[PDB]
């Protein structure tokens, strides 16, 4: 599924990300835009044998089990395929566990590169929330 901006915003809001652990909703809409362009089927293989999956491009080394990644931690305790849903619940639930890590949202390269330190509210303006 490719989500629209506000549509994604609405889903993230119902699923508890606005101000989760202090990050305003714009933070996550921003991360997804740059992680995957809002596409739930986004995949990206990496030199280390891992693969990023889904709308927030979650990595199979640490966060999910894909059956093929050396030394998988599977911290979200889920199959990476579950992150490929049109329904973003599993992605959201895992992203909250990642954001609850020491690094917070800086876990996402894209978010520290292009969302952190900017007017993240921009990403939800135009949306009635």
């Amino acid at each position, epitope marked *: 599924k490719v989500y629209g901006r506000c549509e994604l915003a609405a889903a993230m*809001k*119902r*699923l*508890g*990300l*606005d*101000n*989760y*652990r*202090g990050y305003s909703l714009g933070n996550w809409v921003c991360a997804a835009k740059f992680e995957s362009n809002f596409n739930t089927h986004a995949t990206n293989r990496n030199t280390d044998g891992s693969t990023d999956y889904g709308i927030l491009q979650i990595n199979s080394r*640490w966060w999910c089990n894909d059956g093929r990644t050396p030394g998988s*931690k*599977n*911290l979200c*305790n889920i199959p990476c395929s579950a992150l490929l849903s049109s329904d973003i*619940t599993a992605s959201v*639930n895992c992203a*909250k*566990k990642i954001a*609850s*890590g*020491g*690094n917070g949202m800086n876990a996402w390269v894209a978010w520290r590169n292009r969302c952190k330190g900017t007017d993240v509210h921009a990403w939800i303006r135009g949306c009635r929330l």
Partner: antibody, heavy 113, light 107 residues
Framework: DVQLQESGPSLVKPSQTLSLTCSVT????????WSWIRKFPGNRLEYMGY???????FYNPSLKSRISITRDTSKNQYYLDLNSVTTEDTATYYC???????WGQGTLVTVSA | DIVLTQSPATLSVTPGNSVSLSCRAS??????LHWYQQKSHESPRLLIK???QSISGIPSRFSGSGSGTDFTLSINSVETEDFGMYFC?????????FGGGTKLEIK
């Protein structure tokens, strides 16, 4: 399956450190986030803190600075160290995983002189 | 810190009957409200994740609902083994905080 279990002394004296271990079964501790929770007599649960995958720690501000949560990955153990304890620190102590799926059975540790 | 407040403190119901427990947060916590039941000489068991998400192996008479600040745990026709303490806990805000519990006793 996953199974957690607390151990350590059951008597503690004021200004002494109460120390507990949590021994983990059925997974690597380095494969999850792990927490310490205590229950006082008033059916009052307090979240003490947790430790993430690489040892990053989150402590409750209510703990008077007296807390540390360390771990030994080789032993599939993690620990609670609580400095300068009082009778107020009398509680039933549990370890659990961060998602709350699995908890130790709990261990009563009393403080009082 | 977020403060959770549950009502009533003690709830009495006759077996087979239906119940609804409340957990409320001082300020909004999104859907980041989890529910725990705790019997005598047992540790907590996770019943419901994120307001309304079902947990593997929990009996379907456990349902959770709400959002924002207002939350409810429903048990459909409670059973004798359902009597015990119920707690809500938030995860939207650090430090994580628990309700003061509700006691599910017999009438």
């Amino acid at each position: 399956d996953v199974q957690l279990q607390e151990s350590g002394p059951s008597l503690v004296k004021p200004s002494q450190t109460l120390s507990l271990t949590c021994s983990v079964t059925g997974d690597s501790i380095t494969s999850d986030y792990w927490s310490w929770i205590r229950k006082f007599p008033g059916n009052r649960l307090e979240y003490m803190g947790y430790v993430s995958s690489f040892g990053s720690t989150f402590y409750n501000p209510s703990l008077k600075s007296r807390i540390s949560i360390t771990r030994d990955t080789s032993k599939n153990q993690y620990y609670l160290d609580l400095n300068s304890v009082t009778t107020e620190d009398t509680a039933t102590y549990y370890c659990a995983n961060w998602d709350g799926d699995y908890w130790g059975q709990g261990t009563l540790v009393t403080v009082s002189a | 810190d977020i403060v959770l407040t549950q009502s009533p403190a003690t709830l009495s119901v006759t077996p087979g009957n239906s119940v609804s427990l409340s957990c409320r947060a001082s300020q909004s916590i999104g859907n980041n409200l989890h529910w725990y039941q705790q019997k005598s000489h047992e540790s907590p068991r996770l019943l419901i994740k994120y307001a309304s998400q079902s947990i593997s192996g929990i009996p379907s008479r456990f349902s959770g609902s709400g959002s924002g600040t207002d939350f409810t745990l429903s048990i459909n026709s409670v059973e004798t083994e359902d009597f015990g303490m119920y707690f809500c806990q938030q995860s939207n805000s650090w430090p994580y905080t628990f309700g003061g519990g509700t006691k599910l006793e017999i009438k």
